[PDB]
Paper text:
Here, we conduct a comprehensive functional analysis of the Antibiotic_NAT family of aminoglycoside acetyltransferases. AG resistance is primarily conferred by three classes of aminoglycoside-modifying enzymes (AMEs): phosphotransferases (APHs), nucleotidylyltransferases (ANTs), and acetyltransferases (AACs). AMEs permanently alter the AG substrate, preventing them from binding to their target, the A-site of the 16S rRNA in the bacterial ribosome. The fold typical of the Antibiotic_NAT family is evident in all structures, composed of 13 α-helices and 8 β-strands, and determined structures superpose with pairwise RMSD’s 0.8–1.0 Å between 197 to 266 matching Cα atoms.
The crystal structure of AAC(3)-IIb represents the first molecular image of enzymes with AAC(3)-II activity. Its structure superimposes with RMSD 0.7 Å over 221 Cɑ atoms with the previously characterized AAC(3)-VIa structure, consistent with our phylogenetic analysis placing both these enzymes in the group 4 of the Antibiotic_NAT family. Similarly to the AAC(3)-VIa enzyme, the minor subdomain loop of AAC(3)-IIb contains the conserved Asn208, which is predicted to clash with substituents at position 5 of the AG substrate, thereby explaining the lack of activity toward 4,5-disubstituted AGs. Other notable amino acids in the active site of AAC(3)-IIa that may restrict the size and positioning of AG substrates include Tyr66, positioned near the binding location of the double prime ring, and Phe97, positioned near the central 2-deoxystreptamine ring. Altogether, AAC(3)-IIb—like AAC(3)-VIa—harbors a more restricted active site, consistent with its limited AG specificity. The crystal structure of AAC(3)-IIb features an active site highly like that of AAC(3)-VIa, consistent with the 4,6-disubstituted specificity of Group 4 enzymes. Finally, AAC(3)-IIb was monomeric both in the crystal structure and in solution (not shown). Insert 3 forms a two-stranded antiparallel β-sheet while corresponding to a short α-helix found only in AAC(3)-IIb structure. Representatives of Antibiotic_NAT Groups 2 and 4 were the most restricted in their specificity, and this was reflected in more constrained and smaller active sites, as revealed by the structures of AAC(3)-IIb and AAC(3)-Xa.
Residue numbers in the entry: -1 to 269
Write the structure that this text describes.
Amino acid sequence: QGMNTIESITADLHGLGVRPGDLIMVHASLKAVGPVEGGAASVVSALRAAVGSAGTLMGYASWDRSPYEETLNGARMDEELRRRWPPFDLATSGTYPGFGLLNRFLLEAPDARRSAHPDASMVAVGPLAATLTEPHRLGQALGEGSPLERFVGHGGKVLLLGAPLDSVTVLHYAEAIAPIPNKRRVTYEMPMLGPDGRVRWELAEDFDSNGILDCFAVDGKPDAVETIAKAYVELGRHREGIVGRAPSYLFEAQDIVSFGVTYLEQHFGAP
Ligand SMILES: [Mg+2]
């Protein structure tokens, strides 16, 4: 039909390998998925149907008003602002649109929870929701201690619904743990909520999310996430298929992270 349905999307997910009980991190382009009856909310319903009440869904929500670049690497932050930057509120603050409209609807799903790192904020729904979303500290955006580390430890799977291979966020965790030199770092500041005296701008120091090494940080050229995912795809371990009208991928998170660490060691462990 012109519009896929909750049930037809659930069938496509199952055919791609999603199973009841799974922990799924989703990156979607809902335009690639195409019209579904009831819109993006019905895509969440289908995913929930696919993983059952025991499964957990997860998404990279971030924040539509994050001051990442405005505070990046000791930038003179322009107090022209006079600090009326909107506070990061877990329930009301918007998601970063670049990571997909679906994260807004995961947030609206029943009993969904959201992590407190404003720039790296994660949404999760299901038994593992609090486990995944707490703790989430400045300086632990995507690496050790982050929700990504626990997503990998709990056997998560990465679902791309028409999103490109560079959107595989769990490979930022592989970047963080890979025993190689010359890894790039950044610094920025975020409005925290500390000892309930409102906003306290606090500082983070973390690995660079836009290029872990110099050669991966060039514009117009593949970053490490894309480079590694493409190389991993050649093994034929992942699953591919259509969901709705979107070319889609399902990856085992432990395996692609382990591949990514191996890849980075074999290629950049020399310097
Ligand atoms: Mg369990």
